[PDB]
């Protein structure tokens, strides 16, 4: 707090009524400020949960809840569809995966608490976290579950008046809880998955065999909780683990870890590349820290650019602002949401 004026160009703190397990900036941006929006959720103790859209004023600081949609159970994860960001998929504490078009719901929820999702996606037997929309195939959604499977739905092929969709494909390569799943940015047929079986799997949707991946690799010495593909370097990705490390990978040679990022004091739950800078990656978890890494400083640890110490509880999720370089939203288990940007002098050196 004392050093915040020197460590940050922006630090905004907000206490939500209930904690959010998820955070994702919507891509739209609309005075000496602009309005940005976040997809958030609730995590309650036996009370009505909501899918939430919040607004944030950012300089060219007020945070307000714009929309609350009745949701059945806590929102494990919520992700918007790139081709139509009004469409949001959510992971529930039951098996169903839900889809909402927030323009077709009131801004104020009915106190009856009726969850009326636009689609209920069936296929899983248990809850999960991993959720990914295909940026090259509109409406193709991947989901990871504690039932050890990956489901795929094609939302573009659902009947217009249909409210329930069965999984198009179920991928059964893992032998334990599948923690995360992500499509490649460029190859419409490629996606990666990570699981408690300590493996990273690379899948080709053009393959006739849904029980065997294109590549299976022993990624970590503990559960693998997250993955992220580099949006500038098509062959590169990162994984985060209960190992307390982030691993760096090349799709052309997955049997050899390129690098291991070490600083976290506990389990890592989220890893995300910067949307603006190819060598920048961030990671978060149970140690209540969000680390920012710079690949270009490897060997000069030297690759640790910044440690965000604003949270005093486990970090559940974070999201890089797609419109404002170096702005991050991070959320923790103690109801705190932070919107922050490290000092320009830190990344300009």
């Amino acid at each position: 707090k004392k050093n915040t004026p020197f460590l940050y160009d922006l630090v905004m703190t907000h206490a939500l009524e209930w904690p959010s397990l998820t955070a994702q900036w919507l891509p739209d941006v609309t005075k000496d400020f602009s309005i940005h929006r976040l997809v958030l959720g609730t995590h309650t103790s036996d009370e009505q949960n909501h899918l939430v859209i919040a607004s944030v004023q950012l300089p060219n600081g007020k945070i307000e809840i714009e929309i609350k949609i009745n949701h059945e159970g806590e929102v494990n994860r919520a992700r918007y569809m790139p081709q139509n960001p009004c469409i949001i998929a959510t992971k529930t504490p039951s098996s169903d995966v839900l889809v909402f078009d927030y323009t077709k719901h009131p801004s104020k929820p009915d106190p009856s608490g009726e969850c009326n999702p636009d689609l209920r996606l069936r296929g899983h037997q248990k809850e999960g976290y991993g959720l990914s929309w295909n940026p090259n195939l509109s409406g193709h959604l991947l989901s990871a579950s504690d039932d050890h499977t990956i489901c795929l739905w094609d939302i573009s092929a659902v009947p217009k008046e249909g409210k329930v969709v069965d999984a198009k494909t179920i991928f059964t390569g893992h032998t334990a809880v599948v923690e995360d799943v992500s499509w490649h940015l460029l190859h419409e047929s490629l996606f990666g998955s990570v699981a408690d079986d300590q493996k990273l799997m690379i899948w080709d949707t053009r393959s006739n065999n849904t029980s065997k991946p294109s590549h299976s690799v022993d990624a970590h010495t503990a559960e693998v909780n997250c993955l992220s593909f580099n949006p500038y370097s098509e062959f590169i990705l990162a994984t985060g683990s209960a190992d307390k490390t982030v691993a760096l990978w090349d799709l052309r040679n997955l049997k050899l870890k390129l690098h291991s990022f070490e600083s976290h004091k506990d389990e890592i739950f989220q890893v995300q590349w910067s949307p603006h800078n190819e060598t920048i990656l961030a990671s978060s978890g149970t140690d209540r820290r969000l680390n920012v890494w710079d690949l270009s400083k490897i060997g000069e640890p030297p690759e640790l650019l910044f440690i965000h110490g604003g949270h005093t509880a486990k970090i559940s999720d974070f999201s890089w602002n797609p419109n404002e370089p170096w702005v991050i939203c991070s959320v923790s288990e103690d109801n705190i949401m932070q919107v922050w940007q490290m000092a320009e002098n830190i990344y300009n050196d």
């Binding site: 939500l16 009524e17 995590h43 309650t44 307000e64 809840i65 494990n76 288990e333 103690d334 109801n335």
Partner: peptide
């Protein structure tokens, strides 16, 4: 396993 059992309620309604 990934989430707390007793999420706390803060005294606000937004």
């Amino acid at each position: 396993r990934r989430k707390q059992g007793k999420p706390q309620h803060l005294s606000k309604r937004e």
